[PDB]
């Protein structure tokens, strides 16, 4: 099992936060953030255009496709809902909530997600102030 | 990301239930159960003796080593504690609790585990009647 658990999902989540921040999704940005090497990020980003999860502009700009984005949103929603659960009901040290969520977000289901929304008190923001996207797709 | 999420952990969990049942941990048993092919189970079981997680007797019998076992126990404890959480606090359909746990057990931490025991009402049995092993190692 990979350390990122799910490479493809981690690149897509990253491109998303980078966007959320205002930054331009650039390989170099995914390389540092994910601490991924260069020809690592390259063949992986080069692997995403094959399945149509993104397009790299004639400026190395990373543009998720209507699907990549939908999936990034999915990964981002689980992640922040996981943090919400690890904080609100389990009580895991806030200093570990993230790393733990970085891991769960790749194995959580849509069903458990729908059940969390219903079981959780606040689903608009994560324990870190960020809004939780894609809840509309849930239901 | 692999479908088993964590191959090595899934073989070890399997050898464990097989033991729990009375069966002899045999490759063929891991092959059907895990639905893994043959030269798949072979090079993987053949990969476990390299890291010392098991020994294959002159009868193809699979004997976890003091460490393999400790890890199998760890995987089995998270699995059944996950089911307990997915049933007791989240309310996920019992018909999905397992598959979901089959997935989480490879990303759950010891810390979240320790917090579950404390947050969960019954930690002696899983939602399926099985006892939860290794709780002593937890704390
Ligand atoms: Ni986070
Ligand atoms: Ni992650
Ligand atoms: Ni189970
Ligand atoms: Ni599993």
Curated annotation (Swiss-Prot), chains A, B:
Main subcellular location of this protein, as a coarse class: cytoplasm
Keyword hit for Iron: yes
Annotated compartments: Cytoplasm
Cysteine pairings via disulfide bonds: none
Superkingdom: Bacteria
GO MF, any single term: DNA-binding transcription factor activity
Biological process terms in GO annotation: negative regulation of DNA-templated transcription
Domain HTH dtxR-type as annotated: residue spans: 4-65
GO cellular component, one term: cytoplasm
Keyword Iron among UniProt keywords: yes
Sorted UniProt keywords: Cytoplasm, DNA-binding, Iron, Repressor, Transcription, Transcription regulation
Role noted for this protein: Iron-binding repressor of the dipheteria toxin gene expression. May serve as a global regulator of gene expression. Represses ripA under iron excess.
Subunit structure of this chain's protein: Homodimer.
UniProt record similarity statement: Belongs to the DtxR/MntR family.
Protein name, as recorded: Diphtheria toxin repressor
Species of origin: Corynebacterium diphtheriae (strain PW8)
Gene from which this protein is expressed: dtxR
């Amino acid at each position: 099992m990979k350390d990122l658990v799910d490479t493809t999902e981690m690149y897509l989540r990253t491109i998303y936060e980078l966007e959320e921040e205002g930054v331009t999704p650039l390989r170099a940005r995914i390389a540092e953030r994910l601490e991924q090497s260069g020809p690592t990020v390259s063949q992986t980003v080069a692997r995403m255009e094959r399945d149509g999860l993104v397009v790299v502009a004639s400026d190395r700009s990373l543009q998720m496709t209507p699907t990549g984005r939908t999936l990034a949103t999915a990964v981002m929603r689980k992640h922040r809902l996981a943090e919400r659960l690890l904080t609100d009901i389990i009580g895991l040290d806030i200093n570990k909530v993230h790393d733990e969520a970085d891991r769960w977000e790749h194995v959580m289901s849509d069903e458990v997600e729908r059940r969390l929304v219903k079981v959780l008190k606040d689903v608009s923001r994560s324990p870190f102030g960020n809004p939780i996207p894609g809840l509309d797709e849930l239901g």
